[PDB]
Paper text:
Three competence-associated pilin genes, pilA1-pilA2-pilA3, are found adjacent to comZ in the T. thermophilus strain HB27 genome. PilA2 adopts a type IV pilin fold, a single α-helix packed against four antiparallel β-strands, with a small subdomain inserted between the end of the first α-helix and the beginning of the fourth β-strand, consisting of three short antiparallel β-strands and a short α-helix, linked by an extensive loop region. Although all three related pilin structures share the same fold, the subdomain is consistently absent. ComZ binds specifically to the competence-associated pilin PilA2. Specific binding of the two proteins was confirmed by isothermal titration calorimetry (ITC), which gave a stoichiometry of 1.1 and an equilibrium binding constant (Kd) of 0.69 μM. Our model for the ComZ/PilA2 complex underscores this point by locating PilA2 such that its smaller subdomain sits between the ComZ pilin and β-solenoid domains, suggesting that ComZ could effectively cap the end of the competence pilus fiber. Virtually no reduction in DNA mobility was recorded in the presence of PilA2 alone.
Natural competence is the term used to describe the uptake of “naked” extracellular DNA by bacteria; it plays a significant role in horizontal genetic exchange. Previous work on T. thermophilus HB27 by Friedrich et al. identified a locus containing five open reading frames (ORFs) associated with natural competence. Mutation of pilA1-3 and comZ leads to a loss of natural competence, although piliation is maintained.
Residue numbers in the entry:
A (entry chain A): 32 to 202
B (entry chain B): 30 to 202
């Protein structure tokens, strides 16, 4: 009985991992785009802005999820019109009959600047649940941001506005 | 483009190291052992009609109340005493996996939201650059056998977890 539950738990974890891996890879994806693309983030050659640029999906997920926020003028022209429209922030995948809830979101406030979390929960039909997360920062894309070339990191104060929370045991 | 390939491989390796450590530390949180009725670490009797028989002990309780600092449980769990939490657990540390340091931390969460929740968080930092941070959230409901109404262990009673730490966050600050 212990054995059977342990097997279901192992499977729930494997289902969780496969969704966490795929959704995290989306956050870290980049693409080469022309200088006319609204989704450009950094030029391949800083001395040739008329040439190709790299575009990081990190920026699209960070500012779109769970709700759309305009970036600072330093990223995507400060406009939500220049975030990719095709994206899904959350959902449920079924992996060998195991439902896995998943969510991608940017963090907010100064602490959340340039951070995206990916969180999954697999709920095995026979009981066991497994919840996994991955924390991705703007520094984790390739190539690495530098002082001179900060994208896809936002400038200070250029992330998602702080949502606010006041917790206390007295409450 | 060489560098891109190399860094992707190092990132894959960093992820594998993080997973290994996350699995080992999460398994520790979920571990149980059979103990006699006289054990200070007893949580639930194996037979609900025979408390004189053997008991199950959940390490979940030890990690939840010991990490990152030791807090006394409520009188319903471990006799309400830090003396009845297992000594010599490690809450945090660094493991090196094929030359990749992995920071790891187990802790109970606090306040009403944190009641009966333990997090396990790891960060693998590849010497050549790539970092990978993974977490697992474990609740008292995830042990085997599952807690029930008539047998809640290792879940604390309402108000019987780690006291809330407090945090006042606001963009005005």
């Amino acid at each position: 009985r212990a054995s059977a539950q342990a097997r279901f738990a192992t499977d729930a974890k494997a289902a969780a991992v496969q969704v966490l891996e795929r959704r995290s890879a989306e956050v870290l994806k980049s693409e080469i785009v022309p200088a006319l693309s609204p989704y450009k983030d950094a030029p391949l050659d800083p001395d040739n802005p008329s040439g190709n640029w790299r575009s990081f999906y990190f920026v699209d997920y960070y500012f779109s999820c769970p709700t759309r926020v305009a970036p600072s003028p330093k990223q995507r022209g400060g406009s939500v019109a220049n975030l990719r429209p095709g994206l899904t922030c959350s959902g449920t995948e079924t992996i060998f009959g195991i439902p896995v809830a998943w969510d991608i979101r940017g963090e907010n406030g100064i602490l959340g600047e340039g951070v995206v979390t990916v969180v999954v929960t697999a709920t095995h039909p026979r009981g066991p649940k497994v919840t996994l997360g991955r924390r991705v920062t703007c520094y984790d894309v390739y190539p690495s941001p530098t002082q001179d070339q900060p994208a896809p990191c936002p400038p200070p104060g250029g992330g998602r506005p702080g949502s606010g929370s006041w917790s206390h045991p007295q409450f």
